[PDB]
Amino acid sequence: PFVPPSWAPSVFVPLTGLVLPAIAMATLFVYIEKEAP
Amino acid sequence: EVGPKRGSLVKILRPESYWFNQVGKVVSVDQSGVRYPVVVRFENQNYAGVTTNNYALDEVVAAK
Amino acid sequence: GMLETPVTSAPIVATYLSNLPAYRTGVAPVLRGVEIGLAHGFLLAGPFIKLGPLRNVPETAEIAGSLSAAGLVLILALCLSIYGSAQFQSARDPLFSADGWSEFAAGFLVGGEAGVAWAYVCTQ
Amino acid sequence: AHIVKIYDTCIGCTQCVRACPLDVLEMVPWDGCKASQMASAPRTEDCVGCKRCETACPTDFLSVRVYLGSESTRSMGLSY
Amino acid sequence: WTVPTLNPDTPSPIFGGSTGGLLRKAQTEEFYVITWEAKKEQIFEMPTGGAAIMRQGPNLLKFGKKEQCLALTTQLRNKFKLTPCFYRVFPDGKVQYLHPADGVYPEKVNAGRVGANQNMRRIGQNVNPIKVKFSGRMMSPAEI
Amino acid sequence: MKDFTTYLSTAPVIATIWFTFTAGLLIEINRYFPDPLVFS
Amino acid sequence: DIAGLTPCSESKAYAKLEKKELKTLEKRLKQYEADSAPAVALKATMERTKARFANYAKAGLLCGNDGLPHLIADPGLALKYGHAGEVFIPTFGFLYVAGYIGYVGRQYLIAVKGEAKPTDKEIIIDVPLATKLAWQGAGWPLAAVQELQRGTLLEKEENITVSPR
Amino acid sequence: AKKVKIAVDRNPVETSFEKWAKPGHFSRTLSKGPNTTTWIWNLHADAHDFDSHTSDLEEISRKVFSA
């Protein structure tokens, strides 16, 4: 029941190494630059 | 008539002074009621190269 | 004032820059985005195809290189978009505004990907 | 903006005012010293924190003190 | 003594120009203007680099930050024995005058000045940092 | 001659003579008593 | 013996070490003449090598499995088994010289503090005074102790400057 | 049209060991003697900085030539 599929690394490695960092950097860059009301 | 005699040796009691617990020679004592009338000269300079400083009456005591 | 120099102040140089899409005012920001995106997108495919990890494969080299050029254009489009968000939060040219830059970034994505696709068609 | 404080051990030598490269300090009348003048810091918003004033003060310990604080275009000494 | 009014049409020294001049800050935040009278045409050193010739009579220069203006003021006073004064100019057109704030250079004591940031105690009589803790912000014992 | 002997009394000159003497004594002792490891 | 060590005179590895060093010297010797300058120098080295290994064995040192002398530092073990000359005796040899040097320097420093310009007496040494103090330092342990008992060795706490606390 | 010629001054300086016994003689600042160990380093650092000992170009040149 626990064993993940044999293709899990193919999806999660690019996802956590290329995709989430891109969204995280965009989120952080916008946040720090945001001006107070 | 106020302060130690000119040329006498006094011991400094200002904790923030470079010469705390050290002996210096009195150069002059102002009689105008200023905050720090006593002028003392030292034979060893401080970190800025100065060898003289002004002290209040209660910050200086006679040698011993 | 500033140190005058032919490079900084020359007639021939000034005219050339004034005709570039970036400096050509009077054009909608979206259209300027497409014009700029196409030029960079077309060039971006070159180095990936010739020097990529799959460069020596006969037919896969063209596809892999162009597909990586398309990816880089997508990343650049994100950079353009977030730059507008940070820079323009509150003047003569419409481009340098929150509304203008958002259109500019969208045009770059459309033009850039079209240029990458157009470059691929040239090969095959 | 930095914080600059003048303490009552000032002897009114004026060396801090001359040393300051941004005209932050000035001399004002006083009755607490022989020179009858004291240093003042009316324009600390222009202070950059060089501490040239502290280098120039003869009194021991210093009579002028600079406490580096919040940064800004002026205090960070930027021309851009 | 009254606050001088800046004259934007004042002639400027004979200077070729350099890359050490004003930047985009002058157009968005502020810049500084220094003016003085010259007895005779002479060569002086620009704080931004290079040499300039001052015209006889009024002269005017623009600098990017205050320290540059007061650096030139020191040179003019010490060597040429002149009496320059400089302003702060904002992009909106407002002009603020300073140095000399009251017309007399700060090194010389003048009546009418009000002491600022003067503590009537020694450095050694400040309170301990614990006694100024949780005061809403990082505060030194010297501030209180 | 008084000034010259004063020059020889300066710190660098004294140290050179003193260490030259000190080194020479140690070198000579090890020349006549080679390889000392234990007082014995 | 002590700590599992054995006397170097009875150590097999110690004896083998001497042969190795002499063999190395002999190998270089046979490429020269009988009484040439290089040959004489090499023979002199071999004599010192043989003397050194005899002296250490004669001194009754202890050798480990490495076949090299080891020294005993505990005073009780040293005096118990006659190893006082390794560390114990040299300990009091050094302290006498170290105290001699330090005591002589302290005497000179006190002597010039009374002069008008002490600083000029430090860069420019007063050689006649220094030689006088150099000889009188031989009795420093006696003089040092008497100062301690009379209470003039240390300054008063009230005459020493300290930082705010 | 200044002619090219040999030009010297006779006995400009006296040969004595007096100044060998007065460290720092070359500089006004160090001539007073030491008060802190910083003086010792300043003596060696500024020994050959002729241009700062005197403002006379002729005196500087003569030291360079003999050094």
Ligand code: CLA
């Ligand atoms: C975990 C992080 C990570 C991952 C997963 C990758 C993955 C990859 N890297 Mg590496 N790289 C990384 C971090 C990473 N890198 C970092 C941190 C650096 C800097 C030190 C580099 C520097 C680097 C270089 C310099 C190169 C690579 C290359 C590669 C490729 C090698 C395999 C190959 O033959 O691809 C072949 C690739 C393809 C056949 C195409 C794959 C898909 C493309 C790239 C994107 C497609 C996008 C799609 C069309 C539209 C968007 C979809 C999206 C929204 C879901 C592969 C795509 C090589 C390459 O070929 O890059 C292009 C290459 O030259 N990387």
Ligand code: CLA
């Ligand atoms: C600067 C150093 C350098 C260089 C020249 C290269 C070069 C290369 N690397 Mg390597 N690499 C480097 C450092 C470098 N690498 C480092 C430090 C690492 C460790 C992190 C790696 C890790 C790495 C990996 C993992 C891989 C490579 C690969 C490659 C190849 C393809 C790269 C690619 O797709 O670029 C794409 C190129 C561009 C998008 C453009 C490049 C810049 C252009 C040409 C500038 C042109 C400017 C122009 C002249 C200006 C004109 C102005 C005018 C109009 C006014 C290529 C041979 C890949 C391969 O397969 O190699 C065989 C691969 O898989 N590299």
Ligand code: CLA
């Ligand atoms: C640096 C600390 C230190 C240490 C760890 C040791 C350790 C040792 N010493 Mg040594 N010793 C030292 C310093 C030290 N000593 C000093 C400074 C002196 C005075 C100069 C001595 C004088 C001395 C003597 C006279 C003797 C030892 C002995 C010993 C051994 C057993 C007793 C002992 O001292 O127990 C642990 C150590 C301590 C708690 C510190 C104080 C030790 C005192 C000074 C000596 C105790 C001797 C003991 C009563 C002997 C009883 C008979 C024994 C066979 C059981 C042990 C290897 C004995 C020995 O040779 O055993 C084989 C022995 O007879 N030591």
Ligand code: SF4
């Ligand atoms: S703060 Fe120091 S330098 Fe300034 S006037 Fe007072 S004593 Fe003089």
Ligand code: SF4
């Ligand atoms: S720190 Fe610098 S700018 Fe500030 S008052 Fe002191 S000298 Fe002037």
